[PDB]
């Protein structure tokens, strides 16, 4: 109902240290996405390798 900020990206995403906070959040979100995508793609690749082994 009420935020700690005041307005849109002119008030949000710019608090005087915006670059550091946004660099931190992006460099945290990227490794998690990399981990999950690597794990799921490896999961699919193991079944692919099992299927191709069936020959």
């Amino acid at each position: 109902m009420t935020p700690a900020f005041a307005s849109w990206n002119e008030f949000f995403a710019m608090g005087g240290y915006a670059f550091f906070v946004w660099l931190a959040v992006v460099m945290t979100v990227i490794p998690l996405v990399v981990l999950v995508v690597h794990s799921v793609m490896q999961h699919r690749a193991i079944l692919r390798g099992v299927a191709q082994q069936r020959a």
Partner: protein, 231 residues
């Protein structure tokens, strides 16, 4: 009660959806009831917010590694091959958490330090923890024959848990020897701790999701020559 067959893949398959669908609903509260609802401090302005992206990446930085000893203790004295693979399962998760913690520390240092890197105990400890993590990763991805890489990783992580408190406790004293003071005081603000608790529980819930999902992968990588995988 504990007669684990190669059913874990079927066992931790009913857990992944419910443990991950809830892994975002609690994290979307620890990051939105923060980052826009939590008032900031006075000395750092609107920069006292990286806590949620740094402290949970630091508490579970060692919280995973402390769980490694249990995963290796059961896998050595009781000689359980499956649980030993757990040590090889969540290691990348811990390494990523440590790297995230280091990056967030470097980013948080800039407003006050003026430079990217200064050797601090609360940060060099995470650096050396990353170093033990990458050592474990290199050890496991070295043996061509399985059922041995896990056991070597278990003994190595046991040695690491033995030597970790000594290393850390030498680190804060080495920091005091040269610099001689503390940077930030242990003050968390009463109306700033509940968002931190929510973020801690969210990161814990996501780490469990990653470790179970990787456990599903590791079982197949070592049990790929049996009729069980006929499905």
């Amino acid at each position: 009660q504990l007669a684990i067959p190669p059913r874990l893949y079927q066992i931790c398959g009913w857990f992944i959806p419910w443990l991950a669908i809830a892994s975002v609903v609690v994290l979307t509260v620890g990051w939105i009831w923060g980052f826009g609802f939590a008032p900031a401090d006075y000395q750092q302005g609107n920069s006292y917010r990286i806590i949620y992206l740094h402290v949970p990446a630091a508490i579970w930085s060692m919280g995973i590694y402390a769980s490694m000893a249990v995963a290796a203790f059961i896998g050595l004295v009781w000689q359980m091959k499956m649980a030993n693979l757990a040590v090889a399962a969540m290691a990348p998760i811990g390494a990523v958490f440590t790297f995230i913690a280091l990056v967030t520390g470097s980013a948080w240092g800039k407003p006050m330090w003026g430079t990217w890197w200064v050797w601090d105990a609360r940060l060099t400890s995470e650096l050396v923890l990353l170093f033990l993590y990458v050592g474990v990763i290199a050890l496991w991805h070295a043996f061509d024959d399985r059922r041995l890489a896990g056991r070597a990783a278990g003994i190595l992580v046991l040695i690491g848990v033995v030597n970790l408190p000594i290393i850390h406790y030498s680190v804060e004293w080495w920091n005091t020897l040269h610099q001689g003071s503390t940077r930030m005081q242990q003050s968390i603000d009463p109306a700033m701790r509940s968002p931190l608790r929510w973020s801690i529980f969210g990161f814990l819930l996501l780490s469990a999701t990653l470790t179970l999902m990787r456990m599903r992968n590791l079982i197949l990588l070592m049990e790929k020559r049996r009729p069980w995988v006929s499905e």
